[PDB]
Amino acid sequence: SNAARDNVTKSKISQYKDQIFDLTYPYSGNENSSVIAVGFLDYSCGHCKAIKNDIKQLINDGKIKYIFRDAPILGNASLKAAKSALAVYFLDKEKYFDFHHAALSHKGEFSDESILDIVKNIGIDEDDFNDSIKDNADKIEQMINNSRLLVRDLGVGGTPFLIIGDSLFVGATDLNVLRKKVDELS
């Protein structure tokens, strides 16, 4: 696009800053970094799957806080995988990225079983996992609804997209562009 439209994006990010940088959502990287990235993903989306290592590398660079917004819009399978991801988060936050990355690595469509195969491979017990789904159902539901509305409010109209600082990157953004913006802001 161009300057005028980027300026509007900056104003919207300020308007929704409490929502975008909400602290109750899962994050990796430096908790205390002022350079905060906020990623919006559907696990069944082809472009979301393909940037999984861009995300991993950008996080491992060490410079940012990266918040994960699970924004399922591609159907029942995505909602399941999204719900399951947060069900892991609330059991053990250190395992959320592992579910995240495995879900993105999961090439075919999700099924109840394949999601459990993932919960098993990352060290979580089926019964702890089932109790998490049920016990935290209201809060998971609330978090996903709030992310969907945020995606609507930002008007992007699909996934993936990534907010860093006052900028919004749409689609499979090259890693070098993200890194330059992060450095500029550091």
From TrEMBL:
Disulfide bonds join C45-C48. This is DsbA-like disulfide oxidoreductase. It comes from Wolbachia pipientis wMel. The chain holds residues 66 to 248 of 252 of the full protein.
